[PDB]
Design a protein around this ligand. Structure first.
Ligand SMILES: Cc1cc2nc3c(=O)[nH]c(=O)nc-3n(C[C@H](O)[C@H](O)[C@H](O)COP(=O)(O)OP(=O)(O)OC[C@H]3O[C@@H](n4cnc5c(N)ncnc54)[C@H](O)[C@@H]3O)c2cc1C
Ligand SMILES: N[C@@H](Cc1c[nH]c2ccccc12)C(=O)O
Length: 632
């Protein structure tokens, strides 16, 4: 009888199928003829956008070792073409059918399909993706609508893309909001560009969770009074974070939108705008929309008349063309019967690492963990190794399952505290998840085995991408050595991120907050770098309309709209004039001097002197314990 049956083949299943093939483990795939959202967009000519995740976190290690030459954000078209490439490789192992039920028994599961053919398999892996009504809404969007008003009740990456397609046709956008977290998907470090996933250095949580909190959360929590940051100019973007009860930050369950800042979009695309726009690189700078009044934030209880399609704000009954509210993504799971009898209910927090449900036997979930930043590939590549190791090695299967409920309890205590399960529990920081899985599999690194300072840069500062853990050991991929070499050379061995931690080692969280925003351009939501691109924004809108073959009238200054903009930006108009011109930009000075210190001792063996003390203390970090990794 079959050893492994995989249900669903799109993107998440790729690395697991690759490993089962290499161990020549018997397996079968069943995926529906229907296809994915990527197929639907392909079939309607709608793959004209880009990923919000960098290439090095969005493509699998066995592609990166062949294809990586620089950091960049691939297009949707590039993403899907990689999906299809791998489908052509394994299509002979795919039965085109739709799974309707799984009866889970002691040794095996009985799988049913719509064609009526049944299958028996010892191990069952589900990688079927998620449902979103927002997908159908993008597949039916008319991008030639112009001179209209739109009302949004949710803000997310899908909503942000629609706003980017609506802005150039002179459409006005109203956001009825209880706040959202937005982050520049690319930032500058002493002028040079870094995708945000490059600057997370997540293993510094092992030094101290308080130090790691100071490294990451001042752009998310309103910790600085600096009047240049968007959460001071537009306080309706602030969310109610009272649910957070973990000492691990960024907390599991936090989601952010990643967007092109206009200064970085200009840097990359201004010399060939019409071509870049047509390739899928669209300007989606929400901070620029608020700055210019093209998007306004209004209180979440602003009244809407759905009968008349009006919304009333600033004393104005504003008629609107369309109202938009996105649904909750739910996973696409078939009916699963505990013991062939009891319906199973999915709950992310009641599974181990989002993969192992504790009510079932030999059933695994692949692709249902979401990364807080970067691509899903980092997550699904590590999940695939975990799953493959579970399927093919009984000693590991037993070592994990013998205390499964206790591992889940300790995991949840660490990352959720006493919070009730939330809809977004499945979102995790990618460098915590890949490192968590690595330590479970045993392909992690050990902080105490670093010899030189260059070793400490790799352990702590080099991003915890899946390929980081595939240089040596059980899941080693050929070519990973040159890839890490390329990445280090191209990012100066990540000395810049390492120096950030050193600069804040003795600050409290408010000192750290103001230090983050003392740079000439701080990483995220710097409102000082918007007005200077007003001219370019007009060039962008003209070029966008040329690509879309549309004629649009911008002569009518919407006076009603201008009035509503003025009402909505009163805090901005008060705090923005407080923006200071400094003599010293403290963060820029500290990072330059810290980088020059590190590159002079890069090759020194572990043997300012207070920085020396800090660096030597990285060999035995005292917050290294993760109790869900142990077998008691
Ligand atoms: C608009 C949009 C933009 C995105 N952008 C990014 C991005 O920039 N970066 C990123 O990392 N991720 C992004 N994602 C995430 C994206 O969902 C994943 O990267 C990927 O598409 C999901 O892979 P999957 O294999 O898990 O699901 P899918 O690709 O949806 O594959 C699941 C497959 O299983 C099939 N299937 C489902 N149920 C059954 C069943 N019962 N029986 C048989 N077959 C079944 C489906 O038909 C489908 O073919 C985006 C998602 C969307 C919707
Ligand atoms: N540590 C870097 C990058 C960073 C901060 N907060 C983040 C949140 C998410 C991703 C990256 C970051 C900085 O302070 O600029």
């Amino acid at each position: 009888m079959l050893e492994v049956c995989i249900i669903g083949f799109g993107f998440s299943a790729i690395p697991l199928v690759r490993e089962l093939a290499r161990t020549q483990t018997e397996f079968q795939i069943i995926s529906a003829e229907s296809g994915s959202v990527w197929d639907r967009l392909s079939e309607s000519g709608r793959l004209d956008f880009s990923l919000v995740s960098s290439f090095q976190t969005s493509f699998y290690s066995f592609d990166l070792v062949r294809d990586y030459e620089k950091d960049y954000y691939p297009t949707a078209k590039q993403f899907y073409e990689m999906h299809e490439r791998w489908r052509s490789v394994y299509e002979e192992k795919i039965i085109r059918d739709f799974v309707t039920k799984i009866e889970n028994f002691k040794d095996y599961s009985l799988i049913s399909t719509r064609s009526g053919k049944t299958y028996e398999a010892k191990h069952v892996v589900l990688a079927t993706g998620f449902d979103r009504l927002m997908n159908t809404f993008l597949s039916n969007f008319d991008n030639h609508v112009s001179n209209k008003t739109f009302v949004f009740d949710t803000m997310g990456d899908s909503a942000n893309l629609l706003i980017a397609k609506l802005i150039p046709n002179n459409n006005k956008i109203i956001l009825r909001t209880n706040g959202f977290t937005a982050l520049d998907q690319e930032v500058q470090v002493l002028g040079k560009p870094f995708t945000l996933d490059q600057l997370e250095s997540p293993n510094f949580r092992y030094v101290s969770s308080e130090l790691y909190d100071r490294l990451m959360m001042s752009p998310v929590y309103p910790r600085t009074v600096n009047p240049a940051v968007s959460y001071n100019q537009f306080p309706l973007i602030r969310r109610d974070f009272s649910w957070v009860d973990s000492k691990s930050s960024p907390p599991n369950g936090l989601i952010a939108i990643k967007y092109w800042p206009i200064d970085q979009y200009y840097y990359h695309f201004n010399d060939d705008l019409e071509n870049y726009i047509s390739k899928g690189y669209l300007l989606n700078d929400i901070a620029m929309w608020l700055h210019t009044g093209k998007v306004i934030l209004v209180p979440s209880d602003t009244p809407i008349n759905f009968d008349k399609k009006t919304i009333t704000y600033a004393g104005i009954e504003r008629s609107f063309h369309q109202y938009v509210k996105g649904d909750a993504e739910q996973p696409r799971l078939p009916t699963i019967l505990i013991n062939g009898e009891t319906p199973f209910e999915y709950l992310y927090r009641d599974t181990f690492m989002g993969v192992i449900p504790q009510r079932l036997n030999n059933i695994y979930f692949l692709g249902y963990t979401r990364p807080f930043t970067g691509g899903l590939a980092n997550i699904t590549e590590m999940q695939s190794l975990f799953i493959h190791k579970l399927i093919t090695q009984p000693q590991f299967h037993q070592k994990i399952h013998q205390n499964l409920s206790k591992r889940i309890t300790a995991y949840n205590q660490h990352y959720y505290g006493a919070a009730k399960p939330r809809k977004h529990d499945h979102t995790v920081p990618f460098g915590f998840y890949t490192e968590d899985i690595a330590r479970l599999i045993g392909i992690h690194y050990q902080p105490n085995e670093c010899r030189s300072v260059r070793d400490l840069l790799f352990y702590y500062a080099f991003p915890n991408n899946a390929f980081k853990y595939r240089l040596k050991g059980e899941y080693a991929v050929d070519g990973v050595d040159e890839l890490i070499q390329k990445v280090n050379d191209k990012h100066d061995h990540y000395a810049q991120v390492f120096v950030q931690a050193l600069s804040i080692r003795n600050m409290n969280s408010d000192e750290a907050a103001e230090w983050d925003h003392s740079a000439r351009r701080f990483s995220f939501n710097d409102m000082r770098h918007k007005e200077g691109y007003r001219a370019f924004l007009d060039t962008y809108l003209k070029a966008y309309r040329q690509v879309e073959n549309i004629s649009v009238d911008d002569t009518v200054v919407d006076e009603e709209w201008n009035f509503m903009v003025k009402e909505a930006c009163q805090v901005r108009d008060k705090v923005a004039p407080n923006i200071e011109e400094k003599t010293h930009y403290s963060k820029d000075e500290d990072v330059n001097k810290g980088i020059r210190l590190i590159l002079s001792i890069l090759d020194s063996d572990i043997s300012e002197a207070q920085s020396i003390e800090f660096i030597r203390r990285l060999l035995q970090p005292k917050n290294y314990e993760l109790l869900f990794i142990r077998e008691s």
